[PDB]
Nucleic acid binder design. Structure first.
Ligand SMILES: [Mg+2]
Ligand SMILES: [Mg+2]
Ligand code: NA
Length: 327
DNA sequence: CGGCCTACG
DNA sequence: CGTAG
DNA sequence: GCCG
C-alpha cells in the first residue's frame, strides 16, 4: 500500500464501506473544529480502506497500512468487534456536529460562518431565515434553494443540462467544447452538483467566454442564481422535472486549451486525490501543480501537457483513469 | 518537530 | 469571507 | 493524526 492516494487505484465502490464511512465522520468532525491535520489523516486512512482488494475482517490486517496509528486502528477495532464505534456515535449524536453539518451544507456558508452562528445560539434553517439581514445574497439563495440542493442529481439530468449548456456555449463561441467533469466523470450515477469545463481548440479564443455564456443562459431563464472578467461560475440552474423543475448547483469553468489537461485533472477530483497529487508533486518531485499547470521552480518552466496521461508521466506515476481516482 | 493543495469569486 | 476539486 |  503506497502512502499517497495518487499512487494507487481507488474505485468508486469497494469492500470496506462501513469502515471508511466511520473514519470519514471523524474527518468531517475534525474539519468543523478547524483541525485540518486530523481531517487529513482520517480521510487518508478511510481512503486506504477504499483501495484494499477485500474486506478488513481482523485488526492484524491494518498492520503496515499507511495512516493507521493508534486512533484510526481503535475505531476499526471497535467496529470489527461490536459493529459500532462509540466515538463515532457520540459525534453523530452531538448538537455541534449536526448543526455544523446543516449550516455548512448551505451554499455560501463555510465552517467559519457556521461556527460563529453556532456560538451565537443558532441551530436550525428557520433560525437563519428569521434573521435575514445577517445573510449575504449568496447565503439567501443557498437557504431558499437548500431543499432542492439537498436532493442528488441523476446522470440523465446531467445529460439534459449538458445539452442546454452546449447550446449556449455554441452561440457564445462556435467551436467551443463542453466536458463533463467532477464526480460524474469518475463514474458516479448521482451527485449533488454538476461541473463543466469549457475550452476552444484555438488558444486565446476562450478569452472573455464565460460572461458570454452566462448572459445567454440568463436570457434563456435557466439561471436561478449566479455571482454577477472571470473563469469559474458557481450557479444554481433550473433543471426540468415532470410538470415542474428543481434547483441544481452547476459549476462552469473556462480554460485555455494549453491548460485544459490540468483543469480537467483538477476538476475531476476526487478532492482528496487532488490534494494528494499536489502534495506528491511538490514533496516527492519538487514540482508545483495546480489547475493551470505544473511548474519546475528550479528551471523556472511550465510542463506542456497535451493529456492527463502526460501529467501522470511527468510526475512518474502510473496513469489512473477517472473511475480509479475516487480517493 | 513541521507539514498537511492551491487556486479563483 | 465564500467557492472548487 | 499521522508521516518522515
Ligand atoms: Mg461536483
Ligand atoms: Mg461543483
Ligand atoms: Na457551504
Amino acid at each position: 500500500m503506497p502512502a499517497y492516494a495518487c499512487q494507487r487505484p481507488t474505485p468508486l465502490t469497494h469492500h470496506n464501506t462501513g469502515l471508511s464511512e466511520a473514519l470519514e465522520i471523524l474527518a468531517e468532525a475534525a474539519g468543523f473544529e478547524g483541525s485540518e491535520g486530523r481531517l487529513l489523516t482520517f480521510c487518508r486512512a478511510a481512503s486506504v480502506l477504499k483501495a484494499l482488494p477485500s474486506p478488513v475482517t481482523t485488526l492484524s490486517q491494518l498492520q503496515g497500512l499507511p495512516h493507521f496509528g493508534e486512533h484510526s486502528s481503535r475505531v476499526v477495532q471497535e467496529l470489527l468487534e461490536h459493529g459500532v464505534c462509540e466515538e463515532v456515535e457520540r459525534v453523530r449524536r452531538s448538537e455541534r456536529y449536526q448543526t455544523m453539518k446543516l449550516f455548512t451544507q448551505i451554499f455560501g456558508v463555510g465552517v467559519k460562518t457556521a461556527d460563529r452562528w453556532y456560538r451565537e445560539g443558532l441551530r436550525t434553517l428557520d433560525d437563519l431565515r428569521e434573521q435575514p439581514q445577517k445573510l449575504t445574497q449568496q447565503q439567501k439563495a443557498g437557504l431558499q434553494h437548500h431543499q432542492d440542493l439537498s436532493t442528488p442529481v441523476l446522470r440523465s439530468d446531467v445529460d439534459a443540462l449538458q445539452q442546454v449548456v452546449e447550446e449556449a456555449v455554441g452561440q457564445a463561441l462556435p467551436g467551443a467544447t463542453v466536458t463533463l467533469t467532477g464526480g460524474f466523470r469518475r463514474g458516479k450515477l448521482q451527485g449533488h452538483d454538476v461541473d463543466f469545463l469549457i475550452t476552444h481548440p484555438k488558444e486565446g479564443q476562450e478569452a472573455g467566454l464565460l460572461p458570454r455564456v452566462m448572459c445567454r443562459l440568463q436570457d434563456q431563464g435557466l439561471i436561478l442564481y449566479h455571482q454577477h472578467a472571470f473563469e469559474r461560475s458557481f450557479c444554481i440552474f433550473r433543471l426540468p422535472q415532470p410538470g415542474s423543475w428543481k434547483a441544481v448547483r452547476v459549476d462552469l469553468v473556462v480554460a485555455p486549451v494549453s491548460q485544459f489537461p490540468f483543469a480537467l485533472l483538477g476538476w475531476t477530483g476526487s478532492k482528496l486525490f487532488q490534494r494528494e497529487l499536489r502534495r506528491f508533486s511538490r514533496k516527492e518531485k519538487g514540482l508545483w501543480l495546480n489547475s493551470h499547470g505544473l511548474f519546475d521552480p528550479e528551471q523556472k518552466t511550465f510542463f506542456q501537457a497535451a493529456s492527463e496521461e502526460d501529467i501522470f508521466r511527468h510526475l512518474g506515476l502510473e496513469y489512473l483513469p477517472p473511475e480509479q481516482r475516487n480517493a
